[PDB]
Design a protein around this ligand. Structure first.
Ligand SMILES: COc1ccnc2[nH]cc(-c3ccnc(N)n3)c12
Ligand SMILES: [Mg+2]
Lengths: 262, 298
């Protein structure tokens, strides 16, 4: 039906494929940051997951915020004591763009444990907007996933929730996932979820839609499979905790496959 | 830039937003509209964030052009192309003669082009009403004011329930559907099509229930045959009166067979069956469409 916009689906997918390239963060930016590391970024993104949980934000909002952060850090050097300010402002902006009822600015001041003032959060909001030139309508892993889900025969909630879980795990680790586009991470996450739950693979209908095949997805899939296998041992755990919830069908309790047999 | 290059001419609009000025670029001569957005105690308004991000992406002849953003400590100015009038004022000026058919047809065709472009770029407008449709002296009409717009995903999620100015608001919003989609903007354009022909609002309700009852009196109270699932909608009531559907030629009597056909497809109850902007462009109503200038001085 119209909720799946049959007359525009293909146009939209094509437009998102153009925009994701335009909205892509610079892959090698962390090496150019003198004061911050992949580990510090991981801690930040894990905190943002907890924030999204506390205020019951859309997963889309979280994905947008990470996009804004990585793009901001692609051109702006930030000291370690200011990274959380960038993150808080990014999440505020993401909420304003995406949420029906975004949290108040004071609620964003509060969740930083008063590390920052309202004045600082608002000034950072302005700076982020300037650096990003107000270009906030960025494609996310989730915007591709929800389209890919329409290709299931039939729809399976465990598959959908598991794919979201995997896409979210990829947000934490700039190495390797900065090198992959959202549409590609989404494709690998969807295949890996489908395989884990049903034993089935990336369908021919999605090859038709995306031009991606298992061969072209292999690099990301190998990375994602390893992340999935290592998830219980990762220093950051907020996504696994989050995905134990019935809201996401407890999918983080599912066991990853030992091999992919590609 | 900018700013020191603009000479303000006069106030031309207001909203909340929001005030709009006509200005001229002192160096290039370009005439612009300056939409001023006042800042602060929650920082930059989500309506401004959405309008700017979306309008920056949307470059189309039938979509108002955002030229620049002047972003400073206390003020935000959006610099737009200037247009001479809105469709509501034009309808008012066209009392006694009406709007010539070739112009109604040209305007609808252009509105559909602008809308199909939004929908193809995953944007819902959500406030299509004559006041937000701007016209120039060369015969263009353009969608404006994207403060109420939203970038959607596929399939859609639940978005703000408001939404859309009451007279132009689709029955699926009025009945509280969990999901609404591109069809809501087509409903509004259907209302505007009728309004261009008659110069009066098709469904001028004063509350949500009155709005619904006015729609039902015109198009019939919808049942499970016309609109599968309607009786199960959150705000549907089995006690709704059951009005018969009118002879559709009585809704807008001066409209021809092809016009009536298109209007009926834009006002289809079932959002799944309602015509898309993209499909409407190929409707036989537009077989002889041209783009004449407005018949009146703006
Ligand atoms: C009263 O508004 C105008 C009058 C003349 N020309 C205009 N050009 C653009 C505007 C306009 C106003 C409000 N929102 C948006 N997006 N655009 C406008
Ligand atoms: Mg570094």
């Amino acid at each position: 039906s119209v909720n799946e916009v049959p007359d525009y689906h293909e146009d939209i997918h094509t437009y998102l494929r153009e925009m994701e390239v335009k909205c892509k963060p610079k892959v090698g930016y962390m090496k150019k940051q003198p004061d911050i590391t992949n580990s510090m970024r991981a801690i930040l993104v894990d905190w943002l997951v907890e924030v999204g949980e506390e205020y019951k934000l859309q997963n889309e909002t979280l994905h947008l915020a990470v996009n804004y952060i990585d793009r901001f850090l692609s051109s702006m050097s930030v000291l370690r004591g200011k990274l959380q300010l960038v993150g808080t402002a990014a999440m505020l902006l993401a909420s304003k763009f995406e949420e029906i009822y975004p949290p108040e600015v004071a609620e964003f001041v509060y969740i930083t444990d008063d590390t920052y003032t309202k004045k600082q959060v608002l000034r950072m909001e302005h700076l982020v907007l300037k650096v990003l030139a107000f270009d906030l309508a960025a494609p996310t892993i989730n915007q591709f996933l929800t389209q890919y889900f329409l290709h299931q025969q039939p729809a399976n909630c465990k598959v959908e929730s598991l794919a979201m879980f995997l896409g979210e795990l990829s947000l934490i680790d700039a190495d390797p996932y900065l090198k992959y586009l959202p549409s590609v991470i989404a494709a690998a996450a969807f295949h890996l979820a489908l395989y884990t739950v049903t034993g089935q693979s990336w369908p021919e209908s999605l090859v038709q839609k995306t031009g991606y095949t298992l061969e072209t997805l292999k690099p990301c899939l190998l990375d994602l499979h390893q992340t999935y296998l290592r998830a219980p041992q990762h220093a950051q755990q907020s996504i696994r905790e989050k995905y134990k919830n019935s809201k996401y069908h407890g999918v983080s309790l599912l066991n990853p496959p030992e091999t992919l047999n590609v | 830039g900018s700013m020191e290059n603009f000479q303000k001419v006069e106030k031309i609009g207001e909203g909340t937003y929001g005030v709009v000025y006509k200005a001229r670029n002192k160096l290039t001569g370009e005439v612009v509209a300056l939409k001023k957005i006042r800042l602060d105690t929650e920082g930059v308004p989500s309506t401004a964030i959405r309008e700017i991000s979306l309008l920056k992406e949307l470059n189309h002849p039938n979509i108002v052009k955002l030229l620049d953003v002047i972003h400073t400590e206390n003020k935000l100015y959006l610099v737009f192309e200037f247009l001479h009038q809105d469709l509501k004022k034009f309808m008012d000026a066209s009392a006694l003669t009406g709007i010539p058919l070739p112009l109604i047809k040209s305007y609808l065709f252009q509105l559909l082009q602008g809308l199909a472009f939004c929908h193809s770029h995953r944007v819902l407008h959500r406030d299509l009403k004559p006041q937000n449709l701007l016209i120039n002296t060369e015969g263009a009409i353009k969608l404006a004011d994207f403060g109420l717009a939203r970038a959607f995903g596929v399939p859609v999620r639940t978005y703000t329930h408001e939404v859309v100015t009451l007279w132009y608001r689709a029955p699926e919003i009025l009945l509280g559907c969990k999901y609404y989609s591109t069809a809501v903007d087509i409903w509004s354009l259907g209302c505007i099509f009728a309004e261009m022909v008659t110069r009066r609002a098709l469904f001028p309700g004063d509350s949500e229930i009155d709005q619904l009852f006015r729609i039902f009196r015109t198009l019939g109270t919808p049942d499970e045959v016309v609109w599968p699932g309607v009786t199960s909608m959150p705000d549907y009531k089995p006690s709704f009166p059951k009005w018969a559907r009118q002879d559709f030629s009585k809704v807008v009597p001066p409209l021809d067979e092809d016009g009536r056909s298109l209007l009926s497809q834009m006002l289809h109850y079932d959002p799944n069956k309602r015509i898309s902007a993209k499909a409407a462009l190929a409707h036989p109503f537009f077989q002889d469409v041209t783009k004449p200038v407005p018949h009146l001085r703006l």
